[PDB]
Amino acid sequence: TFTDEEMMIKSSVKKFAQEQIAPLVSTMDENSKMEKSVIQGLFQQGLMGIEVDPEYGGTGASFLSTVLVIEELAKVDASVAVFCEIQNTLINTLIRKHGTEEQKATYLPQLTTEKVGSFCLSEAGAGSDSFALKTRADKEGDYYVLNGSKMWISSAEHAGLFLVMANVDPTIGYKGITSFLVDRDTPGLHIGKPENKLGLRASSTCPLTFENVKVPEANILGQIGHGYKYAIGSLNEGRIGIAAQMLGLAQGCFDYTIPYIKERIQFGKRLFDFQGLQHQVAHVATQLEAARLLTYNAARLLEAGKPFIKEASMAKYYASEIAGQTTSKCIEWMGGVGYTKDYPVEKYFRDAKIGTIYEGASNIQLNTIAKHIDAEY
Amino acid sequence: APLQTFTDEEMMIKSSVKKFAQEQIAPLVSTMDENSKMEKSVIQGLFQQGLMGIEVDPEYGGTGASFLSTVLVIEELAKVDASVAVFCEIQNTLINTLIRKHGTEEQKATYLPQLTTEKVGSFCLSEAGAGSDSFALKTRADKEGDYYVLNGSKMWISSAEHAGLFLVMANVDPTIGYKGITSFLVDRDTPGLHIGKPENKLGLRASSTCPLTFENVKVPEANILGQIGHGYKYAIGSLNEGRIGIAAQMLGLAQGCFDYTIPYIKERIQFGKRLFDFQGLQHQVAHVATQLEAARLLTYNAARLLEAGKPFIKEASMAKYYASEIAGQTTSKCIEWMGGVGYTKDYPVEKYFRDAKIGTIYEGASNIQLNTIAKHIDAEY
Amino acid sequence: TFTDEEMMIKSSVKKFAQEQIAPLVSTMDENSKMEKSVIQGLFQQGLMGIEVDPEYGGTGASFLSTVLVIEELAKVDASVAVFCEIQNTLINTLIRKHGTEEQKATYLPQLTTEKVGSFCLSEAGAGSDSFALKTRADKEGDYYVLNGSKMWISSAEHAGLFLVMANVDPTIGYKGITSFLVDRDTPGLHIGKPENKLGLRASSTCPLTFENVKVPEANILGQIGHGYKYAIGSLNEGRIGIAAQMLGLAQGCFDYTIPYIKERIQFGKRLFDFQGLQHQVAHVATQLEAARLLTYNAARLLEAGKPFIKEASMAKYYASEIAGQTTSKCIEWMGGVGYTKDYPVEKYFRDAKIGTIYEGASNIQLNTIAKHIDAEY
Amino acid sequence: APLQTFTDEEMMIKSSVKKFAQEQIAPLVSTMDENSKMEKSVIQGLFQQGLMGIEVDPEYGGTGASFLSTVLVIEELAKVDASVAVFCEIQNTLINTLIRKHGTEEQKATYLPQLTTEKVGSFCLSEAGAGSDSFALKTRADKEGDYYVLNGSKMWISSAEHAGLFLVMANVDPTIGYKGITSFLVDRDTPGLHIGKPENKLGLRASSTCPLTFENVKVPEANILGQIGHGYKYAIGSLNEGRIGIAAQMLGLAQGCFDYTIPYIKERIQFGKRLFDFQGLQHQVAHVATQLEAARLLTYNAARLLEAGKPFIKEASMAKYYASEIAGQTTSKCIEWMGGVGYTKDYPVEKYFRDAKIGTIYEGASNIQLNTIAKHIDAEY
Numbered sequence A, C: 001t002f003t004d005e006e007m008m009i010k011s012s013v014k015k016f017a018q019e020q021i022a023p024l025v026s027t028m029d030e031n032s033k034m035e036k037s038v039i040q041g042l043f044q045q046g047l048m049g050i051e052v053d054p055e056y057g058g059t060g061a062s063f064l065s066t067v068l069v070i071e072e073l074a075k076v077d078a079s080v081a082v083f084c085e086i087q088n089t090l091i092n093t094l095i096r097k098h099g100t101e102e103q104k105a106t107y108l109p110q111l112t113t114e115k116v117g118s119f120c121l122s123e124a125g126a127g128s129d130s131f132a133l134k135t136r137a138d139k140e141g142d143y144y145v146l147n148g149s150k151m152w153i154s155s156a157e158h159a160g161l162f163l164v165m166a167n168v169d170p171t172i173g174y175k176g177i178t179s180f181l182v183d184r185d186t187p188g189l190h191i192g193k194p195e196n197k198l199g200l201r202a203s204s205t206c207p208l209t210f211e212n213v214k215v216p217e218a219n220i221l222g223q224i225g226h227g228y229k230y231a232i233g234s235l236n237e238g239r240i241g242i243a244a245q246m247l248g249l250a251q252g253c254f255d256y257t258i259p260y261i262k263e264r265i266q267f268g269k270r271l272f273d274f275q276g277l278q279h280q281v282a283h284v285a286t287q288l289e290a291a292r293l294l295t296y297n298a299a300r301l302l303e304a305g306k307p308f309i310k311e312a313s314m315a316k317y318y319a320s321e322i323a324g325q326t327t328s329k330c331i332e333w334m335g336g337v338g339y340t341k342d343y344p345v346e347k348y349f350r351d352a353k354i355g356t357i358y359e360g361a362s363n364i365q366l367n368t369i370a371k372h373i374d375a376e377y
Numbered sequence B, D: 001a002p003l004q005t006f007t008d009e010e011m012m013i014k015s016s017v018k019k020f021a022q023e024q025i026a027p028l029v030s031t032m033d034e035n036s037k038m039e040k041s042v043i044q045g046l047f048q049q050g051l052m053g054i055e056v057d058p059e060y061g062g063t064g065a066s067f068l069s070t071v072l073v074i075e076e077l078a079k080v081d082a083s084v085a086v087f088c089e090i091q092n093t094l095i096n097t098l099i100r101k102h103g104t105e106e107q108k109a110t111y112l113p114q115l116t117t118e119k120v121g122s123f124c125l126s127e128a129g130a131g132s133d134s135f136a137l138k139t140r141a142d143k144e145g146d147y148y149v150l151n152g153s154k155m156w157i158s159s160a161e162h163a164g165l166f167l168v169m170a171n172v173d174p175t176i177g178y179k180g181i182t183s184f185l186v187d188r189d190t191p192g193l194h195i196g197k198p199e200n201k202l203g204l205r206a207s208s209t210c211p212l213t214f215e216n217v218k219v220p221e222a223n224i225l226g227q228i229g230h231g232y233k234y235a236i237g238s239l240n241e242g243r244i245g246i247a248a249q250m251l252g253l254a255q256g257c258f259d260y261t262i263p264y265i266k267e268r269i270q271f272g273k274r275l276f277d278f279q280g281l282q283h284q285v286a287h288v289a290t291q292l293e294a295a296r297l298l299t300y301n302a303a304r305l306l307e308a309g310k311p312f313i314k315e316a317s318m319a320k321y322y323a324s325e326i327a328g329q330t331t332s333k334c335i336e337w338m339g340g341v342g343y344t345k346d347y348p349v350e351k352y353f354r355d356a357k358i359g360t361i362y363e364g365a366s367n368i369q370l371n372t373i374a375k376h377i378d379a380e381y
């Protein structure tokens, strides 16, 4: 039961996705390249500043709107959904919450209209162990020198803004981790070739290297040493976003597959009429239902200002795990055609597999959930 | 708002039941299980606390609360004793609802004040040859003057040992199949009605479960509940609601089991660590917690859909299937997390395990839930 | 494919179980009491000395014969099976392997004819962490004083011999653990009342208290400080025994249930003809087949003198887990009648649940398998 | 003796294929996957190593080895590349077996020497309207003098791009249903036979999978393989063995993936620990190891049952179902254990994952395997 605005935004995104994205899904996947038409369409439609204030060109909508947009996009293409998720839930939120009036006035208008941001936390030696990051920041008078590397950076290929976590004092561990706003065009910053991936292929995923990258002191986001707090704070909200992506992906796969099994006839009946298959369908539908409830409930808790971290982890864990199961089963229900790239279900399957890995792997979600359970008893 | 946000009345009712269960039920749980016998004090308490007429209008002695209140009461009772919870669920969700929905004004005035104050009802559908296939029931009702004569048998009748009222589904015209099935309000002490000995069961042992036989049982024509030949409709309609009620029971028992077990694994030490600090065990606990959360949301959402007058049958089936399946998994894992002590009757987790197993069988076995969900999915595409 | 002797032993055990045990299963379960007639029959049939040399009244059979016997008994009553498994795989084996010729001459003739043995490792503070056992043994000239308590001792109510693990020097930790042959009627040895259990109810499970229990130095089994090794060695073999018990229990439950679902009619069909149910049955059958192959292969690896520990753990883990799944499903396939004590499937379900707990709980089995996988690469 | 105790010849053949696969196949696996194109060198190499006539008698240029040897060759190949394994599986367990078991002495003398040395065969059963329902195939064979004229189409034909021989199931009398189905030996260069474009696939990409069409394809009556109208029996007979072959492929690919992943999780450090030392991950690994072990035993036992002339169809279905299902779970878990690198094509685990998914679909989808298993269980009680 959504507000009028939430319902309108959902219907608008559904139309946009069907008309502007669906025709391109296959070719974007094949060539690991999101089309400019889609990217600029997202900005044009106000989908890159959903919660940002209108004064900065934002839509001014609710967090649940962002969730419904992510879900609705992912029903067509999970790659476009995460592209939208990163901008809204990681980049925009961090700048909204911790930016100075100066930083907000500068960056938010660009971020709602044409500039793409990348969230730069992970390194080769700091994946699940994010706070072991070795990218360092040395204060030299009016600027900081950044040295290190990042790995797996989503949207980096054409990003203009990099939100970079770097340690200003490695002798104090994670409490030296600080957030920096870094412009693309700066000596020493290199964005490498996008990875060649199993799925999520249209979402660029690039290595970064920082060779004596110089960042003005005014480009520190928030307080020195609090960057670890901002990283995991934004990722707590990001887990709801990834729950929504995984949900939408799984739903889109399911929605496509049921009409097929209704129409396909073997042994004189609809595939849907074999009870073994009906039971698998019903089991999966129940899991999709549970996933949707967990995702929306986490979102509503966040909106209400209630504790939501355990619930966000629960949604991301469950939705990502059941998206793997849903997509795997849909290929089977389709049979042979499901194994071919002429049908969409094999892409949903390839895309879903990422969900149990990024924004905190499944084991990490369970660790977080257990910590919360320990504190409740 | 979040699914766990309740009205003031819902919150107050939940709180009262928690207190009542802990004070009046918990000390008797073990004895009742051991002896397969519900205590009169507990039955009296349920009535005295208003828990047998939760949604019934205050004009008939009821509390006039929401359906979600009934769900919360069942859950809360089941955290302490699943057998007491089903006793409450049958009265509210099957018996009272059938009469509230399909009774004449005279029938409501006559039966509801008794059902809210002292009289227990039994729902009588199933037979030896008609379990999942309920509408193959062979109990027949033959019209003689202004009465019907009932002949046949029923099986698996819960609360029969104490019930004053039996809501009996019987066929008035077996040649038209299910469309002959009719609901009858049969009083306990009607000549020809025999209540057999209670089953010796794995769990839910304090809830009496008895066979019935009908030998020329005379029932006035006025004692038909609703329209002749619509008994099948009324039975399954009430069971659609009862499925949310069984979801609530399964949820509550799984939660009670889990809540008991976590403090133990935090306290118990092996290899110098709390059991809770073994990551394998932690992951299992977190996975189970997630399933409990999903089961809760499914159950409450089904209840809210029902309250909003929205379609709820698929969702009720989803809640019952899911809650019952994860109640089995939850209780099975809790025994393991407890270790050896979990396998003994000196601890409560083995009873929760035995009790949970019924949830995938009664009020429509799991396969039947899946068949129902599939029918709705086919209609949606 | 088995040897002529293995086939003959299996066939005679099947007969003995159906004629002498089956009629008593319900009552033994209801009363939590093993019948003396059943115990006498086990000894009389040569089932309590399966691999013991004929010198000592044994049957002189193979280890796989012991596995087949435990499986066949468990098809009728898991409680009777474990009684047999403890005697053969834990007690007899330890005395055969580590006994002096005088100890063998004394105890093995008794253990094959009338005397029941109990294996005494676990304590309240030492279950999974067995080697944290606090029962101590002090040498006082020609004897050892044992002080402490044990928990969960199977067969204790009837046992004339207790094989006890006690620590002779706790500063050395587990390397002080030593094994002692203790006669029932020794002062200071108190056997508590049997546990009131969920299942395996006919197998007595008692606490023991050792208040200054004096064991002659002649009654040390093996070398001092090597008791930890004997304990876990016998338990490696015991794990194959419990796999066989769990296999038999699950197979007996399955074998009972299939005729019912073929005979029972709903909606004008045999229950067996509903495809959802068929698929569940076929899935369980596949797991039963896999559990059997794991159990027998582990047994053959032991007999061939090949490494078998990883394989024994895999068998016990898998067979116990699928015994729980099989019995849970069988109740569902039977419907209402499966939930009543008038039918046998609810007992199989209560009995199966102990399989993932005793003889090293599932998590411990997985830790062991992981240690071996670690060593293979 | 344990199921992993082989004959000296079986051990020798396993070792030989391991060496061949590592030296001749491993370097090319990524290119073949990327290009969807099997390399000529690999196919030539399979023939040269004697891997395309494993069980064929030496009088026809075969090795005359055991069926378990074929299983071990398939397993060992799939550890490196499941596409190459299926290429070998079809030739040995479908094509060579059909002709060995049901060919005349003349057909054996003509075809087996070709098939053991240079000629690839395709097995042509499935159609767009006849997948799981194979025997609903509509390809017709009409008698015209001493010849049969084939008309229709096939779908999903593996190895078609390279095949010189097509074993085609066609119905000579559609009015008698499945009893009209007949196997035909059809040369690639027969007029009227057209091989369509290879499918663009999720995995198994180096194995060509093509549609066929038959326009008045004239076959001499001597080219019927076996008895007219028994082609349904021959086809499903060969598929019962092929199910053990696919079990072996799924087993080998899962094992290869597993074997690659364990050293990685031993060496990768996070939070100061090897990934292998996180107990949650350890338990997942141990669980997967147990499943692999169980799949191996099911696979080898089914093979040994077949060799002993014992009933093996239920066991073959159990092996294929179980191995395919756990290959999916194994490869899915390996990607997770690897983390980010597992999701990239620079590492080999994502290909195992994509390849494994075909296992639950071809050679009789999982549901069909369960149906077959159930039919045998019914006969046993």
Ligand SMILES: Cc1cc2nc3c(=O)[nH]c(=O)nc-3n(C[C@H](O)[C@H](O)[C@H](O)COP(=O)(O)OP(=O)(O)OC[C@H]3O[C@@H](n4cnc5c(N)ncnc54)[C@H](O)[C@@H]3O)c2cc1C
Pocket (backbone or CB within 6 Å): A119, A120, A121, A122, A124, A126, A127, A128, A129, A151, A152, A153, A154, A155, A200, A205, A354, A357, A358, A359, A360, A361, A362, A363, A364, A367, D268, D270, D271, D275, D278, D280, D281, D336, D337, D338, D339, D340, D341, D343
């Ligand atoms: C396509 C893609 C896009 C991404 N997007 C971004 C991005 O935009 N910005 C960014 O900063 N990062 C991004 N990530 C990085 C992502 O968050 C990491 O891949 C993830 O955190 C896991 O790190 P890892 O790959 O180093 O795996 P590892 O940390 O090496 O984990 C491997 C396995 O070890 C297990 N494991 C690790 N630690 C524990 C533990 N303590 N307990 C139990 N199990 C454990 C994990 O659960 C996992 O199963 C992206 C990654 C990918 C693949």
Ligand SMILES: Cc1cc2nc3c(=O)[nH]c(=O)nc-3n(C[C@H](O)[C@H](O)[C@H](O)COP(=O)(O)OP(=O)(O)OC[C@H]3O[C@@H](n4cnc5c(N)ncnc54)[C@H](O)[C@@H]3O)c2cc1C
Pocket (backbone or CB within 6 Å): B123, B124, B125, B126, B127, B128, B130, B131, B132, B133, B155, B156, B157, B158, B159, B201, B204, B209, B358, B361, B362, B363, B364, B365, B366, B367, B368, B371, C264, C266, C267, C271, C274, C276, C277, C332, C333, C334, C335, C336, C337, C339
């Ligand atoms: C303790 C207890 C209390 C009960 N309470 C009551 C009560 O108060 N009043 C009352 O009327 N009944 C009551 N029931 C009856 C209960 O609802 C039935 O046991 C249940 O509906 C199953 O019927 P059955 O036992 O005959 O099993 P069956 O119908 O024989 O089912 C056996 C198995 O077959 C499967 N199956 C059956 N049909 C299909 C199908 N079409 N497709 C796929 N699978 C199928 C089922 O899912 C199940 O797994 C109670 C039962 C018990 C055990």
Ligand SMILES: Cc1cc2nc3c(=O)[nH]c(=O)nc-3n(C[C@H](O)[C@H](O)[C@H](O)COP(=O)(O)OP(=O)(O)OC[C@H]3O[C@@H](n4cnc5c(N)ncnc54)[C@H](O)[C@@H]3O)c2cc1C
Pocket (backbone or CB within 6 Å): B268, B270, B271, B275, B278, B279, B280, B281, B336, B337, B338, B339, B340, B341, B343, C119, C120, C121, C122, C124, C126, C127, C128, C129, C151, C152, C153, C154, C155, C197, C200, C205, C354, C357, C358, C359, C360, C361, C362, C363, C364, C367
């Ligand atoms: C009926 C019965 C009969 C028995 N028979 C005998 C007998 O004859 N003789 C005898 O000596 N003993 C016997 N046992 C004892 C049995 O072996 C123990 O109950 C078992 O080893 C577990 O010990 P615990 O009960 O203290 O549970 P705990 O050790 O407290 O374990 C509880 C849970 O914690 C988990 N856990 C513990 N350690 C770890 C770890 N390192 N990593 C991950 N998870 C962990 C366990 O897997 C389990 O899930 C019997 C027990 C029973 C119930």
Ligand SMILES: Cc1cc2nc3c(=O)[nH]c(=O)nc-3n(C[C@H](O)[C@H](O)[C@H](O)COP(=O)(O)OP(=O)(O)OC[C@H]3O[C@@H](n4cnc5c(N)ncnc54)[C@H](O)[C@@H]3O)c2cc1C
Pocket (backbone or CB within 6 Å): A264, A266, A267, A271, A274, A276, A277, A332, A333, A334, A335, A336, A337, A339, D123, D124, D125, D126, D128, D130, D131, D132, D133, D155, D156, D157, D158, D159, D201, D204, D209, D358, D361, D362, D363, D364, D365, D366, D367, D368, D371
């Ligand atoms: C890469 C590839 C290679 C192949 N190789 C060959 C080859 O060389 N030669 C050849 O002839 N064929 C080959 N096959 C065809 C393959 O065997 C079929 O795809 C398979 O039998 C499934 O048929 P289908 O694709 O039409 O799916 P369908 O028959 O439409 O099945 C779709 C789904 O419906 C379910 N279903 C169908 N019937 C039932 C039932 N009765 N009960 C319960 N569930 C049911 C299935 O289990 C599956 O989940 C190949 C296929 C592929 C994709």
Ligand SMILES: CC(C)(COP(=O)(O)OP(=O)(O)OC[C@H]1O[C@@H](n2cnc3c(N)ncnc32)[C@H](O)[C@@H]1OP(=O)(O)O)[C@@H](O)C(=O)NCCC(=O)NCCSS
Pocket (backbone or CB within 6 Å): A121, A122, A127, A128, A129, A130, A131, A174, A232, A233, A235, A236, A309, A358, A359, A360, A361, A364, A368
């Ligand atoms: C967050 C992280 C890195 C912390 O692990 P670890 O180093 O073991 O953390 P801890 O020792 O428990 O705590 C360190 C600090 O983090 C905080 N913290 C840890 N998890 C948190 C969470 N989920 N939410 C908020 N704070 C958290 C702790 O409160 C502590 O801060 P303070 O000293 O100010 O109280 C880990 O749990 C995690 O989530 N890793 C995956 C990160 C991720 O999602 N990456 C994906 C990037 S986009 S694909």
Ligand SMILES: CC(C)(COP(=O)(O)OP(=O)(O)OC[C@H]1O[C@@H](n2cnc3c(N)ncnc32)[C@H](O)[C@@H]1OP(=O)(O)O)[C@@H](O)C(=O)NCCC(=O)NCCSS
Pocket (backbone or CB within 6 Å): B125, B126, B131, B132, B133, B134, B135, B178, B232, B233, B236, B237, B239, B240, B313, B361, B362, B363, B364, B365, B368, B372
């Ligand atoms: C309800 C029942 C018996 C019907 O099975 P079946 O005979 O296959 O039903 P159908 O042939 O699909 O339809 C029969 C009638 O019931 C209706 N119906 C079936 N399921 C229904 C449901 N869940 N809700 C409402 N109506 C339902 C049908 O619409 C039809 O009525 P109409 O002719 O008025 O449209 C079966 O689905 C079921 O739920 N069985 C278990 C019953 C149960 O829960 N027993 C427990 C008692 S307490 S333990």
Ligand SMILES: CC(C)(COP(=O)(O)OP(=O)(O)OC[C@H]1O[C@@H](n2cnc3c(N)ncnc32)[C@H](O)[C@@H]1OP(=O)(O)O)[C@@H](O)C(=O)NCCC(=O)NCCSS
Pocket (backbone or CB within 6 Å): B271, C121, C122, C127, C128, C129, C130, C131, C174, C232, C233, C235, C236, C309, C358, C359, C360, C361, C364, C368
């Ligand atoms: C065996 C036990 C107690 C060891 O605990 P743990 O902390 O892992 O011990 P470790 O540090 O691994 O090693 C201690 C010694 O035991 C040995 N050991 C451990 N597990 C072993 C096994 N499965 N087989 C053989 N030896 C084993 C080690 O080799 C070491 O001996 P050495 O010092 O001579 O090399 C534990 O893994 C276990 O299995 N617990 C359950 C015990 C059980 O089955 N109880 C049931 C009784 S009847 S229900």
Ligand SMILES: CC(C)(COP(=O)(O)OP(=O)(O)OC[C@H]1O[C@@H](n2cnc3c(N)ncnc32)[C@H](O)[C@@H]1OP(=O)(O)O)[C@@H](O)C(=O)NCCC(=O)NCCSS
Pocket (backbone or CB within 6 Å): D125, D126, D131, D132, D133, D134, D135, D178, D232, D233, D236, D237, D239, D240, D313, D361, D362, D363, D364, D365, D368, D372
């Ligand atoms: C075999 C097949 C096609 C037919 O199923 P179905 O319609 O239920 O067949 P049935 O009615 O049970 O029996 C039809 C005939 O086939 C026989 N048969 C069926 N399954 C058999 C099996 N597994 N082994 C041997 N014979 C079998 C029957 O005995 C009967 O022949 P007879 O009249 O001589 O006794 C189906 O079960 C199957 O296996 N489908 C998948 C086919 C496959 O593997 N395709 C892959 C090609 S390569 S990817």
Ligand SMILES: [Cl-]
Pocket (backbone or CB within 6 Å): A051, A052, A053, A056, A058, A096, A108
């Ligand atoms: Cl803003």
Ligand SMILES: [Cl-]
Pocket (backbone or CB within 6 Å): A034, A083, A154, A155, A156, A157, A202, A203, A204
């Ligand atoms: Cl991108």
Ligand SMILES: [Cl-]
Pocket (backbone or CB within 6 Å): B055, B056, B057, B060, B062, B100
């Ligand atoms: Cl009312």
Ligand SMILES: [Cl-]
Pocket (backbone or CB within 6 Å): B038, B087, B158, B159, B160, B161, B162, B206, B207, B208
């Ligand atoms: Cl009662």
Ligand SMILES: [Cl-]
Pocket (backbone or CB within 6 Å): A287, B291
């Ligand atoms: Cl789930």
Ligand SMILES: [Cl-]
Pocket (backbone or CB within 6 Å): C051, C052, C053, C056, C058, C096
């Ligand atoms: Cl001996």
Ligand SMILES: [Cl-]
Pocket (backbone or CB within 6 Å): C034, C154, C155, C156, C157, C158, C202, C203, C204
């Ligand atoms: Cl005993």
Ligand SMILES: [Cl-]
Pocket (backbone or CB within 6 Å): C287, D291
């Ligand atoms: Cl399994």
